[PDB]
Design a protein around this nucleic acid. Structure first.
Ligand SMILES: [Mg+2]
Ligand SMILES: [Mg+2]
Ligand SMILES: [Mg+2]
Length: 65
RNA sequence: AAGUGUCUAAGGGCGCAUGGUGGAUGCCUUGGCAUCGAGAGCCGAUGAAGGACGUGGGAGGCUGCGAUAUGCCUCGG
């Protein structure tokens, strides 16, 4: 998973693009799991956690980091 | 001829032998009861107490959490 330390250099738009990419990846993983071709089921939790990480970074950046 | 004379058990009773059922007794316990010594004595429109509905790779309950959903960040151990 992407680390907060290496996340904290993207300014705002790179963070937003990363969040969009992560949401798309999570969507794809959900579909693959639904149709039964996903083997490593830990990927869903990993992607959910990195989405939460990006959201946390954005929010704390807004609220006087 | 006259006379004397057993036994059996369809079922039943008593006593043993050997089983069944049942869960008393004995011995226990992540459960209670009664106090003692320290704290803290309020929470809420910055939305409470308490909930409904969801959330995990696999159905449900409990427990945690809230679409960032058995979790996110920071500092300590
Ligand atoms: Mg008899
Ligand atoms: Mg008989
Ligand atoms: Mg640590």
């Amino acid at each position: 998973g992407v680390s907060p330390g290496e996340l904290r250099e993207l300014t705002d738009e790179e963070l937003a693009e990363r969040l969009r990419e992560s949401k798309e990846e999570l969507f794809n993983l959900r579909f693959q799991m639904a149709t039964g071709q996903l083997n490593n089921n830990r990927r869903l939790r990993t992607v959910r956690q990195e989405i939460a990480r990006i959201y946390t970074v954005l929010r704390e950046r807004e609220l006087g980091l």
